[PDB]
Design an enzyme around this catalytic site. Structure first.
Site, PDB file in Angstrom:
ATOM      1  N   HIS A 141      45.245 -19.913  21.044  1.00 19.23           N
ATOM      2  CA  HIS A 141      45.545 -20.299  19.670  1.00 19.23           C
ATOM      3  C   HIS A 141      44.658 -21.488  19.255  1.00 19.23           C
ATOM      4  O   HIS A 141      43.847 -21.376  18.332  1.00 19.23           O
ATOM      5  CB  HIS A 141      47.037 -20.661  19.563  1.00 19.23           C
ATOM      6  N   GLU A 142      44.823 -22.616  19.956  1.00 15.52           N
ATOM      7  CA  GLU A 142      44.217 -23.879  19.569  1.00 15.52           C
ATOM      8  C   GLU A 142      42.714 -23.979  19.839  1.00 15.52           C
ATOM      9  O   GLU A 142      41.980 -24.577  19.051  1.00 15.52           O
ATOM     10  CB  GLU A 142      44.957 -25.037  20.254  1.00 15.52           C
ATOM     11  N   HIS A 146      41.303 -21.871  16.534  1.00 11.30           N
ATOM     12  CA  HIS A 146      41.066 -23.038  15.674  1.00 11.30           C
ATOM     13  C   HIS A 146      39.762 -23.760  15.988  1.00 11.30           C
ATOM     14  O   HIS A 146      38.974 -24.025  15.075  1.00 11.30           O
ATOM     15  CB  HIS A 146      42.234 -24.035  15.718  1.00 11.30           C
ATOM     16  N   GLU A 177      45.885 -19.242  10.731  1.00 11.55           N
ATOM     17  CA  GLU A 177      47.066 -19.350  11.571  1.00 11.55           C
ATOM     18  C   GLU A 177      47.652 -17.993  11.940  1.00 11.55           C
ATOM     19  O   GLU A 177      48.352 -17.877  12.937  1.00 11.55           O
ATOM     20  CB  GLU A 177      48.111 -20.220  10.901  1.00 11.55           C
TER      21      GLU A 177
HETATM   22 ZN   LIG Z   1      47.793 -23.518  14.639  1.00 11.16          ZN
END
Ligand SMILES: [Zn+2]
Length: 332
Positions: A141-142, A146, A177
């Site tokens: 995710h991060e 991102h 997201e």
């Molecule tokens: Zn996030």
């Protein structure tokens, strides 16, 4: 999240707990409040409320409670040593070893937050409730989403506000997201989107409810008072007098993004989508001619693209988001 984390959260939590959940927190914040962002996310949506509840109920049907779901699917709670070990292995796997500072904290309202401290990327990981099979997902995710999107975006003509305007970009969210949330549950055996669904749900109710009411309402889905306190605060970020209805609707972005990306997965080029940076899935065709893609990075889990798509199918099946339902949801 730093700006909308109440400055008196602890004193109000003790008050709330000590009153046996009857007190309404009177939060205060670091002045000035980001009025523009509060107003932007002052209204909750109900577009996907039945999908949220669908996911929540799917979990509770299979695992009975969240408590058992967490322990059965999440794995063991991790020590600091184990966290660092998993992180180090991930960074090397992603080819971004030595680029990001890693920090461990207890005072995060989420599992992790990717930041820019000292004009440099910083990954803050919540040591409280970090789990074996879940932590790898956080990193996907991060870092996998991102961070890689961020680095790719910095290389593009739309790397700043002016560039976005000039090239006529839709907002990065909910695509950002949405992609990150799908990636968190990518290689899991039971990839239920619990966090996304419950955040969506909690905000929907927060718009109608006081803190007291919201906290009680959540009891039906999760018992732990500490877990519930987190979800309530996240949903009411910015609210001073939480006795009144109202929400910060930002966290609805996760489910909103998930549904949209899954709906349109067949027409989305996921490598390209990541390579173009902080862009909407809808802008891909618009921006493709103007993107600089020589030295853009695609996450490791996207290299076997055939497998990546299979995982997305597995995620839909698991979360009761079949093709036909997505079709009716968004007849695009
Ligand atoms: Zn996030």
């Amino acid at each position: 999240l730093v700006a909308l984390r109440p400055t008196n959260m602890d004193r109000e939590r003790d008050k709330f707990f000590q009153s046996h959940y009857t007190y309404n927190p009177q939060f205060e914040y670091q002045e000035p409040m980001p009025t523009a962002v509060l107003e932007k996310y002052c209204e909750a949506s109900g577009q996907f409320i039945h999908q949220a509840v669908g996911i929540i109920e799917a979990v509770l049907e299979k695992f009975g409670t969240y408590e058992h779901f967490e322990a059965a699917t999440g794995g063991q709670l991790l020590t600091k040593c184990q966290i660092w070990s998993i992180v180090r292995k991930y960074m090397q796997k992603e080819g971004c070893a030595g680029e990001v500072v890693v920090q461990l904290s207890e005072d995060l309202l989420s599992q992790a937050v990717m930041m820019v401290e000292n004009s440099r990327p910083t990954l803050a990981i919540n040591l409280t409730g970090a789990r074996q099979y879940w932590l790898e997902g956080m990193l996907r995710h991060e870092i996998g989403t991102h961070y890689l999107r961020g680095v790719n975006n910095a290389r593009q003509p739309w790397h700043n506000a002016e560039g976005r305007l000039r090239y006529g970009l839709r907002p990065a969210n909910p695509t950002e997201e949405g992609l990150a949330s799908l990636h968190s549950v990518l290689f899991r055996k039971q990839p239920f989107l619990w966090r996304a669904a419950l955040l969506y749900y909690t905000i929907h109710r927060a718009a109608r409810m006081s803190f007291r009411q919201l906290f009680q309402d959540l009891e039906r889905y999760v018992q732990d008072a500490d877990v519930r306190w987190e979800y309530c605060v996240r949903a009411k970020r910015g609210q001073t007098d939480t006795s009144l209805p109202g929400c910060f609707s930002k966290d609805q972005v996760y489910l909103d993004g998930i549904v949209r990306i899954l709906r349109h997965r067949q027409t989305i080029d996921f490598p390209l989508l990541t390579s173009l940076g902080k862009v909407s899935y809808e802008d891909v065709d618009h921006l493709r001619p103007h993107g600089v893609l020589d030295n853009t990075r695609v996450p490791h889990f996207m290299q076997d693209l055939a497998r990546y798509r299979q995982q997305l199918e597995h995620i839909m099946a698991t979360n009761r988001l079949d093709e036909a339902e997505l079709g009716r949801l968004l007849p695009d």
